Amino acid sequence: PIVVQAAGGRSWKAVDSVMFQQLQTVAMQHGLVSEDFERQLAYYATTWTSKDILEVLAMMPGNRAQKELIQGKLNEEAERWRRNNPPPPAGGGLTVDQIMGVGQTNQAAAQANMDQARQICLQWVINALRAVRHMAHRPGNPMLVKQKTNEPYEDFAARLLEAIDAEPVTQPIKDYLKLTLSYTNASADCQKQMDRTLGQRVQQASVEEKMQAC
Amino acid sequence: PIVVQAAGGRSWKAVDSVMFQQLQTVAMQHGLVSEDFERQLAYYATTWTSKDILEVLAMMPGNRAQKELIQGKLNEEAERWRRNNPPPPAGGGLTVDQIMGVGQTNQAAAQANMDQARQICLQWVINALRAVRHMAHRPGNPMLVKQKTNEPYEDFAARLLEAIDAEPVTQPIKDYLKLTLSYTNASADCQKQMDRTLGQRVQQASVEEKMQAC
Amino acid sequence: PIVVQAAGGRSWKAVDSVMFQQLQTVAMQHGLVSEDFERQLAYYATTWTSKDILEVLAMMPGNRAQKELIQGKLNEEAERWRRNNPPPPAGGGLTVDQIMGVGQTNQAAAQANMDQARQICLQWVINALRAVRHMAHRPGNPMLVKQKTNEPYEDFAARLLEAIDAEPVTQPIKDYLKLTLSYTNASADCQKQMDRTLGQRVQQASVEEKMQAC
Amino acid sequence: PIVVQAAGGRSWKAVDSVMFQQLQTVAMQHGLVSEDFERQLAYYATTWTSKDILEVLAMMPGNRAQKELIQGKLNEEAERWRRNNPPPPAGGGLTVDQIMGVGQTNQAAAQANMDQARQICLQWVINALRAVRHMAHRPGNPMLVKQKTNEPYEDFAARLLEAIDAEPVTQPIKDYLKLTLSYTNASADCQKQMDRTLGQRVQQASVEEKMQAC
Amino acid sequence: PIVVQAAGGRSWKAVDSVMFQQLQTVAMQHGLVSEDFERQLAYYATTWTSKDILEVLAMMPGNRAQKELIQGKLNEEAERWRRNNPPPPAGGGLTVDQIMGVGQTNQAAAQANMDQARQICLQWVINALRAVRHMAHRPGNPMLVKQKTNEPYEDFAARLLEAIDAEPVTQPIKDYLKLTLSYTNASADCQKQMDRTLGQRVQQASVEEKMQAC
Amino acid sequence: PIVVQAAGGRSWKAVDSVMFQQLQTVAMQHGLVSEDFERQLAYYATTWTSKDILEVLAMMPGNRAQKELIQGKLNEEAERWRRNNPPPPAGGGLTVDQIMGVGQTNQAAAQANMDQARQICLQWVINALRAVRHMAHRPGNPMLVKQKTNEPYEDFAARLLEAIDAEPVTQPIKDYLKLTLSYTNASADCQKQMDRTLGQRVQQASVEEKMQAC
């Protein structure tokens, strides 16, 4: 974390044991790659220095094969950033090193010059966790989801909505799935009940309207 | 949360892990849509910035079908606010975006300019949670409640009072129900005991007076 | 709670999660109406603003029939206060509204003008909890208490002393009960042992002197 | 507790929930009258105002017969103090009321004028707890203690030392007991072993020297 | 820990019980020599004075044979440092004593003069823990690892990656192992599946590409 | 504990409940006389005033026979200090009373004049705990230790190293034991394996070298 001193200069402070434990328990209960960990990480990582975002991620509980993958993606995110942007002549303001906090004192990766590098690092870590999560799902998962025999639509909606979230497809194509796949994937019995209540709203009806049926 | 610095300027601070856990456990023990979560949220969310009210709600434990509904209602609350009020020419002081903290640094959604947007956001979240809760109950629930055979009136009162609370009907019509439905719903045996003790106070007697019987 | 800033102006702060949990656990372990909750509430509620005394009571764990009664009494306490005191012309310094923190920002129910209203509110809540507790006991409970066959006098004293506490009768009439009922309620076997050891101190002997017997 | 503000004026603060729980658990695990509670109370009660020493004692877990006795003794301690000292003309600097914090705002029982009353109150509470503890033991307990058949001397020493502590006899007469009763109470088998090893040190040997035997 | 006072002078503060417990639990759950303990130690030990790095390591939970080894290595690290660097004439700026905080007040091992000694001490402790860990593994562990019959490649990757980490061989030779040993160690059935999917990428394919197979 | 105020004057503060619990749990899990308690006590007792070192030791969990012994030794440590040093004429700067904090306000045993007395008190308490621990072990314990039949050398090393630690013999004579007793105490089977691998290093080999065998 970074503490902004009264004068205006900034100093480094270690992640507060409590916050470290909170992120740890969430990773242990769910997954380091899980969406939950990503959510809490982003909210509390604003203050975290680029080096901390990488040390307090490597202390979190997970498999060693998984950690290699999370570091595989953080590398491809870095190489992309190096490519997407031509270095400015003289090598520019920033480097993947500065961003990943390589060879920097913990009180210099928390100075004002590293605010931008600090944000880009967290951006990559969240993207890396999402990438490992996305691959963990074979494509077509919303298509694969089918309302289980005699299972509440709520349960089907929860599987289907997560499956649509699992896909990295843009929000608009995700929306289409919520409208189209829900009715189709819906088990025939709910689908017949939806057809009578929804009527023409076969795709028009929202998932909530579909939830009203069965 | 927002911290008001001595000078008067305001800065952003993350929800204190302890408070986050307290809201989380309450949601896990009851429901994110449950009244309990709504109560603690409102008391502790005053300081919370509009963005936090939306991030610290999405980290709370609940079903994914339920979260879609809570976001369904927050949308209809926003569209209503956009409709109820004509935008002032030049688009006015505020936008649903400013209110929902869209594209704002966490240290700018906590400045004095966003006090009003901060309150309107929480207003919508509490209303959204109530709406999901209300629909979860089919209308006529107080009418549906009937003192269970050989069950304490206290237990009946607890079901009936919550059922009256479940209805979004104004407080005065809710009061009428406490006076009228209680005696009628009351099982014949308590109802006969209430008739002799209450006498003319068949609807006049308060639920507490009815509690004295059986 | 209210924080007195150095300048002298006051600002509002939410009940510290820890203190909220401490009151909550006590209510869950005992009762919201229980004496224990009343004791801790009074000690820690001094700082609490009138609004908090009512929000941090409604979040505490209890039955919904019970909460109606606690709000029934807080109403009769308010109507009494409205009656006991004629409003001063112009409606006076205070109103039940100001006292119950109705339509007040949480940073204005904590200003110096609301110190008096803040205390009167807590006074009513403690009285309300006591009233629900008192009614929960049918009158004559000390008279009803009888030393159980072959039960330590200590156990009898604990039941009888609480029964005398349950009665809202003034402290002096409560004292008489400790002196008179104890010996009479005492089971014949202890009562015979008390008669020989106490001698003339049949009512003169304190409960502690009676405790020495059996 | 009392907080000494920078200027020098003092203000009242509630016992920190953590410290309250620590004293509570100790009382629940041992006893409110137990020595353990008395030890922690004295160390942490220095700051506590006279009123707090009486409110944070009445919230602690114990039987209601026991609490009457603890209040019985606090009364006889007060009447003694009222007797032991003639009131100075005009009624003097202090009163049992000021000492027991009767009719005083919690921010006035923590001002410098009440430092002396604050200490005298705690003095009485510790003495009161000791008195209830002492009576709980019939006199002659060290004499009653006898090394149990085939029980470690350590276990005997622990019972005997507590029994000597239970007696309110001055420290010097307590010491004599550690030297005399130990050997006599010691079971014949250890006593024979002590006689050969201790030799003339039958009373001369300390309990530690006796511990070396069996 | 070291606290930098406003003036600029530094003072000593004990490791915060919470942080001590966090390191302790991690050591108890894993090992004092375990990598996990090393990670958290390095992140939180920056502030720790050289003396604390040695006292808060000796209080951590572990076997006494293990602690001798951790102190064996810290000695050979010190003798190396004494050798690697000739002492400057007059014995130079620093000594293994100053580094290991020998005969220094806890408020002088935290002054600015001991920043360098403070870092060198932690450097040795982390190296010492790694050395005990490395020896605990017989050389050739990656070679020893063989994908267990009918075990997920993920599980094999986790064993193999840790085995490659166990070896103190430079990062580049470790990388070669991830590319070469993985396919060879891979059980014939996965190895055949890898051969068809990987094709020429027998060593070219990354562990993640190998993970895609079985 | 002692708090150094900005001006420079010092004030007393009670041991932070958390730190008290941490020392308590360690004593309960191990022993008040155990080495573990001694380690944490020394690190956290620097700030503690002489009176606290004696009150926060008497509240710790242990047998009453044990506490008498810990107070037996603290007395012989004091009498030694009184003897070892002639009192300076006028009775000198210090007294065992000042050191043991006898008849001193808790805000005067924490002033700068009592820094020296504060350290000497803790010195005695640690020595007292060690003395009780040492006697608890009959002399010759390292000689007594013999590698248990079919038990890892590690387990033998752990028993032997603690046994060498149990002895209060100077560090150099303790070292000789680690070199000599280890091989001799080692069970014949490990001893034969050590003889072949160690060769001439029968006493030359360190315990770690011996650990490599069996």
Side-chain angles (χ1 to χ4, degrees):
Chain A
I2 305 180
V3 293
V4 177
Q5 289 167 356
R10 303 191 304 179
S11 180
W12 171 89
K13 179 181 59 59
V15 295
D16 301 0
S17 179
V18 178
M19 179 176 57
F20 176 90
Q21 298 179 0
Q22 178 184 179
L23 299 182
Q24 180 180 0
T25 180
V26 173
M28 181 179 301
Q29 298 178 0
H30 303 273
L32 182 59
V33 58
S34 179
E35 303 180 0
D36 300 0
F37 182 90
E38 302 179 0
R39 301 178 181 180
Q40 299 185 180
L41 180 61
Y43 183 31
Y44 298 149
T46 301
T47 60
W48 294 28
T49 67
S50 60
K51 299 179 58 181
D52 301 0
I53 306 179
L54 299 179
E55 298 172 359
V56 190
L57 176 76
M59 306 172 195
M60 293 313 179
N63 203 4
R64 176 53 183 117
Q66 176 183 0
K67 298 180 179 180
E68 170 224 359
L69 311 173
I70 303 174
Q71 185 60 60
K73 315 287 182 167
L74 208 70
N75 297 359
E76 65 69 59
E77 297 296 359
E79 67 71 60
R80 179 178 298 120
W81 179 90
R82 181 180 301 120
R83 298 179 299 120
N84 293 0
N85 192 31
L94 196 60
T95 70
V96 165
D97 292 0
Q98 291 184 359
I99 301 190
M100 301 268 291
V102 177
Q104 202 163 1
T105 70
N106 239 351
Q107 207 261 357
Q111 298 292 356
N113 53 0
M114 296 285 300
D115 283 300
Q116 178 64 2
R118 182 183 64 240
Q119 301 178 0
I120 305 183
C121 179
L122 178 60
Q123 181 60 240
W124 297 333
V125 173
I126 306 179
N127 300 0
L129 298 179
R130 299 182 179 120
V132 176
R133 182 183 62 181
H134 299 150
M135 63 178 181
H137 298 270
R138 180 174 60 61
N141 298 298
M143 303 299 179
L144 299 178
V145 173
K146 299 298 300 181
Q147 180 177 180
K148 180 59 182 60
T149 300
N150 192 31
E151 295 298 359
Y153 175 90
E154 181 180 0
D155 300 0
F156 161 88
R159 300 188 300 299
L160 181 62
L161 296 180
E162 295 296 0
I164 303 179
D165 299 0
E167 302 301 300
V169 294
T170 61
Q171 178 65 2
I173 183 181
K174 294 184 177 181
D175 299 0
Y176 177 90
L177 303 181
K178 302 178 181 180
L179 300 180
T180 302
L181 300 182
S182 180
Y183 181 90
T184 62
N185 301 0
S187 60
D189 301 0
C190 287
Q191 181 178 0
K192 300 178 181 180
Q193 300 180 0
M194 300 179 183
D195 183 0
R196 58 181 179 180
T197 180
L198 302 182
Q200 181 180 0
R201 301 178 300 180
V202 172
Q203 178 182 359
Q204 303 177 0
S206 61
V207 174
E208 177 180 0
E209 300 178 60
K210 300 180 179 180
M211 298 184 61
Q212 304 302 300
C214 64
Chain B
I2 305 180
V3 293
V4 177
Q5 289 167 356
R10 303 191 304 179
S11 180
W12 171 89
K13 179 181 59 59
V15 295
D16 301 0
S17 179
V18 178
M19 179 176 57
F20 176 90
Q21 298 179 0
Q22 178 184 179
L23 299 182
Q24 180 180 0
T25 180
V26 173
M28 181 179 301
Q29 298 178 0
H30 303 273
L32 182 59
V33 58
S34 179
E35 303 180 0
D36 300 0
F37 182 90
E38 302 179 0
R39 301 178 181 180
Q40 299 185 180
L41 180 61
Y43 183 31
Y44 298 149
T46 301
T47 60
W48 294 28
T49 67
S50 60
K51 299 179 58 181
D52 301 0
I53 306 179
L54 299 179
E55 298 172 359
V56 190
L57 176 76
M59 306 172 195
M60 293 313 179
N63 203 4
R64 176 53 183 117
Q66 176 183 0
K67 298 180 179 180
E68 170 224 359
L69 311 173
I70 303 174
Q71 185 60 60
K73 315 287 182 167
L74 208 70
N75 297 359
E76 65 69 59
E77 297 296 359
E79 67 71 60
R80 179 178 298 120
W81 179 90
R82 181 180 301 120
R83 298 179 299 120
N84 293 0
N85 192 31
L94 196 60
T95 70
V96 165
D97 292 0
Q98 291 184 359
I99 301 190
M100 301 268 291
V102 177
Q104 202 163 1
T105 70
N106 239 351
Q107 207 261 357
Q111 298 292 356
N113 53 0
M114 296 285 300
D115 283 300
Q116 178 64 2
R118 182 183 64 240
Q119 301 178 0
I120 305 183
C121 179
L122 178 60
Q123 181 60 240
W124 297 333
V125 173
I126 306 179
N127 300 0
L129 298 179
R130 299 182 179 120
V132 176
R133 182 183 62 181
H134 299 150
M135 63 178 181
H137 298 270
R138 180 174 60 61
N141 298 298
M143 303 299 179
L144 299 178
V145 173
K146 299 298 300 181
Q147 180 177 180
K148 180 59 182 60
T149 300
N150 192 31
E151 295 298 359
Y153 175 90
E154 181 180 0
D155 300 0
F156 161 88
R159 300 188 300 299
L160 181 62
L161 296 180
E162 295 296 0
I164 303 179
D165 299 0
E167 302 301 300
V169 294
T170 61
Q171 178 65 2
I173 183 181
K174 294 184 177 181
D175 299 0
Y176 177 90
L177 303 181
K178 302 178 181 180
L179 300 180
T180 302
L181 300 182
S182 180
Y183 181 90
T184 62
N185 301 0
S187 60
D189 301 0
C190 287
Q191 181 178 0
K192 300 178 181 180
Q193 300 180 0
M194 300 179 183
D195 183 0
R196 58 181 179 180
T197 180
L198 302 182
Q200 181 180 0
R201 301 178 300 180
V202 172
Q203 178 182 359
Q204 303 177 0
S206 61
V207 174
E208 177 180 0
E209 300 178 60
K210 300 180 179 180
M211 298 184 61
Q212 304 302 300
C214 64
Chain C
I2 305 180
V3 293
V4 177
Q5 289 167 356
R10 303 191 304 179
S11 180
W12 171 89
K13 179 181 59 59
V15 295
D16 301 0
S17 179
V18 178
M19 179 176 57
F20 176 90
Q21 298 179 0
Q22 178 184 179
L23 299 182
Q24 180 180 0
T25 180
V26 173
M28 181 179 301
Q29 298 178 0
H30 303 273
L32 182 59
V33 58
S34 179
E35 303 180 0
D36 300 0
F37 182 90
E38 302 179 0
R39 301 178 181 180
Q40 299 185 180
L41 180 61
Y43 183 31
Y44 298 149
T46 301
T47 60
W48 294 28
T49 67
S50 60
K51 299 179 58 181
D52 301 0
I53 306 179
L54 299 179
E55 298 172 359
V56 190
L57 176 76
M59 306 172 195
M60 293 313 179
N63 203 4
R64 176 53 183 117
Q66 176 183 0
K67 298 180 179 180
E68 170 224 359
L69 311 173
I70 303 174
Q71 185 60 60
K73 315 287 182 167
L74 208 70
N75 297 359
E76 65 69 59
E77 297 296 359
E79 67 71 60
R80 179 178 298 120
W81 179 90
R82 181 180 301 120
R83 298 179 299 120
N84 293 0
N85 192 31
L94 196 60
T95 70
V96 165
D97 292 0
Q98 291 184 359
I99 301 190
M100 301 268 291
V102 177
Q104 202 163 1
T105 70
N106 239 351
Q107 207 261 357
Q111 298 292 356
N113 53 0
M114 296 285 300
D115 283 300
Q116 178 64 2
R118 182 183 64 240
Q119 301 178 0
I120 305 183
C121 179
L122 178 60
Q123 181 60 240
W124 297 333
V125 173
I126 306 179
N127 300 0
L129 298 179
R130 299 182 179 120
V132 176
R133 182 183 62 181
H134 299 150
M135 63 178 181
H137 298 270
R138 180 174 60 61
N141 298 298
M143 303 299 179
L144 299 178
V145 173
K146 299 298 300 181
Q147 180 177 180
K148 180 59 182 60
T149 300
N150 192 31
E151 295 298 359
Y153 175 90
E154 181 180 0
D155 300 0
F156 161 88
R159 300 188 300 299
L160 181 62
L161 296 180
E162 295 296 0
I164 303 179
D165 299 0
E167 302 301 300
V169 294
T170 61
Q171 178 65 2
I173 183 181
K174 294 184 177 181
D175 299 0
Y176 177 90
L177 303 181
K178 302 178 181 180
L179 300 180
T180 302
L181 300 182
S182 180
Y183 181 90
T184 62
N185 301 0
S187 60
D189 301 0
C190 287
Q191 181 178 0
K192 300 178 181 180
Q193 300 180 0
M194 300 179 183
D195 183 0
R196 58 181 179 180
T197 180
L198 302 182
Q200 181 180 0
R201 301 178 300 180
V202 172
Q203 178 182 359
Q204 303 177 0
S206 61
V207 174
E208 177 180 0
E209 300 178 60
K210 300 180 179 180
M211 298 184 61
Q212 304 302 300
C214 64
Chain D
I2 305 180
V3 293
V4 177
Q5 289 167 356
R10 303 191 304 179
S11 180
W12 171 89
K13 179 181 59 59
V15 295
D16 301 0
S17 179
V18 178
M19 179 176 57
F20 176 90
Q21 298 179 0
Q22 178 184 179
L23 299 182
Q24 180 180 0
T25 180
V26 173
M28 181 179 301
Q29 298 178 0
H30 303 273
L32 182 59
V33 58
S34 179
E35 303 180 0
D36 300 0
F37 182 90
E38 302 179 0
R39 301 178 181 180
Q40 299 185 180
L41 180 61
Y43 183 31
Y44 298 149
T46 301
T47 60
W48 294 28
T49 67
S50 60
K51 299 179 58 181
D52 301 0
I53 306 179
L54 299 179
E55 298 172 359
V56 190
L57 176 76
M59 306 172 195
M60 293 313 179
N63 203 4
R64 176 53 183 117
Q66 176 183 0
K67 298 180 179 180
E68 170 224 359
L69 311 173
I70 303 174
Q71 185 60 60
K73 315 287 182 167
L74 208 70
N75 297 359
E76 65 69 59
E77 297 296 359
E79 67 71 60
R80 179 178 298 120
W81 179 90
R82 181 180 301 120
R83 298 179 299 120
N84 293 0
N85 192 31
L94 196 60
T95 70
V96 165
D97 292 0
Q98 291 184 359
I99 301 190
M100 301 268 291
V102 177
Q104 202 163 1
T105 70
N106 239 351
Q107 207 261 357
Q111 298 292 356
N113 53 0
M114 296 285 300
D115 283 300
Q116 178 64 2
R118 182 183 64 240
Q119 301 178 0
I120 305 183
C121 179
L122 178 60
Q123 181 60 240
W124 297 333
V125 173
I126 306 179
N127 300 0
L129 298 179
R130 299 182 179 120
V132 176
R133 182 183 62 181
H134 299 150
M135 63 178 181
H137 298 270
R138 180 174 60 61
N141 298 298
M143 303 299 179
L144 299 178
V145 173
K146 299 298 300 181
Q147 180 177 180
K148 180 59 182 60
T149 300
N150 192 31
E151 295 298 359
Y153 175 90
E154 181 180 0
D155 300 0
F156 161 88
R159 300 188 300 299
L160 181 62
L161 296 180
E162 295 296 0
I164 303 179
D165 299 0
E167 302 301 300
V169 294
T170 61
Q171 178 65 2
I173 183 181
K174 294 184 177 181
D175 299 0
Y176 177 90
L177 303 181
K178 302 178 181 180
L179 300 180
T180 302
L181 300 182
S182 180
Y183 181 90
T184 62
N185 301 0
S187 60
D189 301 0
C190 287
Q191 181 178 0
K192 300 178 181 180
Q193 300 180 0
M194 300 179 183
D195 183 0
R196 58 181 179 180
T197 180
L198 302 182
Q200 181 180 0
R201 301 178 300 180
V202 172
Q203 178 182 359
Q204 303 177 0
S206 61
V207 174
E208 177 180 0
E209 300 178 60
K210 300 180 179 180
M211 298 184 61
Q212 304 302 300
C214 64
Chain E
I2 305 180
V3 293
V4 177
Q5 289 167 356
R10 303 191 304 179
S11 180
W12 171 89
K13 179 181 59 59
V15 295
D16 301 0
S17 179
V18 178
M19 179 176 57
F20 176 90
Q21 298 179 0
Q22 178 184 179
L23 299 182
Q24 180 180 0
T25 180
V26 173
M28 181 179 301
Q29 298 178 0
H30 303 273
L32 182 59
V33 58
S34 179
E35 303 180 0
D36 300 0
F37 182 90
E38 302 179 0
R39 301 178 181 180
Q40 299 185 180
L41 180 61
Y43 183 31
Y44 298 149
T46 301
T47 60
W48 294 28
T49 67
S50 60
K51 299 179 58 181
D52 301 0
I53 306 179
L54 299 179
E55 298 172 359
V56 190
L57 176 76
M59 306 172 195
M60 293 313 179
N63 203 4
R64 176 53 183 117
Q66 176 183 0
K67 298 180 179 180
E68 170 224 359
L69 311 173
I70 303 174
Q71 185 60 60
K73 315 287 182 167
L74 208 70
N75 297 359
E76 65 69 59
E77 297 296 359
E79 67 71 60
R80 179 178 298 120
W81 179 90
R82 181 180 301 120
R83 298 179 299 120
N84 293 0
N85 192 31
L94 196 60
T95 70
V96 165
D97 292 0
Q98 291 184 359
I99 301 190
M100 301 268 291
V102 177
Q104 202 163 1
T105 70
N106 239 351
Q107 207 261 357
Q111 298 292 356
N113 53 0
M114 296 285 300
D115 283 300
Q116 178 64 2
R118 182 183 64 240
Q119 301 178 0
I120 305 183
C121 179
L122 178 60
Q123 181 60 240
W124 297 333
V125 173
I126 306 179
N127 300 0
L129 298 179
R130 299 182 179 120
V132 176
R133 182 183 62 181
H134 299 150
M135 63 178 181
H137 298 270
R138 180 174 60 61
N141 298 298
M143 303 299 179
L144 299 178
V145 173
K146 299 298 300 181
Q147 180 177 180
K148 180 59 182 60
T149 300
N150 192 31
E151 295 298 359
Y153 175 90
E154 181 180 0
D155 300 0
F156 161 88
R159 300 188 300 299
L160 181 62
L161 296 180
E162 295 296 0
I164 303 179
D165 299 0
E167 302 301 300
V169 294
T170 61
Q171 178 65 2
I173 183 181
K174 294 184 177 181
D175 299 0
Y176 177 90
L177 303 181
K178 302 178 181 180
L179 300 180
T180 302
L181 300 182
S182 180
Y183 181 90
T184 62
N185 301 0
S187 60
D189 301 0
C190 287
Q191 181 178 0
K192 300 178 181 180
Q193 300 180 0
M194 300 179 183
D195 183 0
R196 58 181 179 180
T197 180
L198 302 182
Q200 181 180 0
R201 301 178 300 180
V202 172
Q203 178 182 359
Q204 303 177 0
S206 61
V207 174
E208 177 180 0
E209 300 178 60
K210 300 180 179 180
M211 298 184 61
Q212 304 302 300
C214 64
Chain F
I2 305 180
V3 293
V4 177
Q5 289 167 356
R10 303 191 304 179
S11 180
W12 171 89
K13 179 181 59 59
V15 295
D16 301 0
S17 179
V18 178
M19 179 176 57
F20 176 90
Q21 298 179 0
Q22 178 184 179
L23 299 182
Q24 180 180 0
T25 180
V26 173
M28 181 179 301
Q29 298 178 0
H30 303 273
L32 182 59
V33 58
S34 179
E35 303 180 0
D36 300 0
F37 182 90
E38 302 179 0
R39 301 178 181 180
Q40 299 185 180
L41 180 61
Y43 183 31
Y44 298 149
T46 301
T47 60
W48 294 28
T49 67
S50 60
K51 299 179 58 181
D52 301 0
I53 306 179
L54 299 179
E55 298 172 359
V56 190
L57 176 76
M59 306 172 195
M60 293 313 179
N63 203 4
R64 176 53 183 117
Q66 176 183 0
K67 298 180 179 180
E68 170 224 359
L69 311 173
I70 303 174
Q71 185 60 60
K73 315 287 182 167
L74 208 70
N75 297 359
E76 65 69 59
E77 297 296 359
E79 67 71 60
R80 179 178 298 120
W81 179 90
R82 181 180 301 120
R83 298 179 299 120
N84 293 0
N85 192 31
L94 196 60
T95 70
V96 165
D97 292 0
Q98 291 184 359
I99 301 190
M100 301 268 291
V102 177
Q104 202 163 1
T105 70
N106 239 351
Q107 207 261 357
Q111 298 292 356
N113 53 0
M114 296 285 300
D115 283 300
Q116 178 64 2
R118 182 183 64 240
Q119 301 178 0
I120 305 183
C121 179
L122 178 60
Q123 181 60 240
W124 297 333
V125 173
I126 306 179
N127 300 0
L129 298 179
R130 299 182 179 120
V132 176
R133 182 183 62 181
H134 299 150
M135 63 178 181
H137 298 270
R138 180 174 60 61
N141 298 298
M143 303 299 179
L144 299 178
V145 173
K146 299 298 300 181
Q147 180 177 180
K148 180 59 182 60
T149 300
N150 192 31
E151 295 298 359
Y153 175 90
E154 181 180 0
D155 300 0
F156 161 88
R159 300 188 300 299
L160 181 62
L161 296 180
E162 295 296 0
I164 303 179
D165 299 0
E167 302 301 300
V169 294
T170 61
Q171 178 65 2
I173 183 181
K174 294 184 177 181
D175 299 0
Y176 177 90
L177 303 181
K178 302 178 181 180
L179 300 180
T180 302
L181 300 182
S182 180
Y183 181 90
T184 62
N185 301 0
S187 60
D189 301 0
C190 287
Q191 181 178 0
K192 300 178 181 180
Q193 300 180 0
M194 300 179 183
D195 183 0
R196 58 181 179 180
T197 180
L198 302 182
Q200 181 180 0
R201 301 178 300 180
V202 172
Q203 178 182 359
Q204 303 177 0
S206 61
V207 174
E208 177 180 0
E209 300 178 60
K210 300 180 179 180
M211 298 184 61
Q212 304 302 300
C214 64

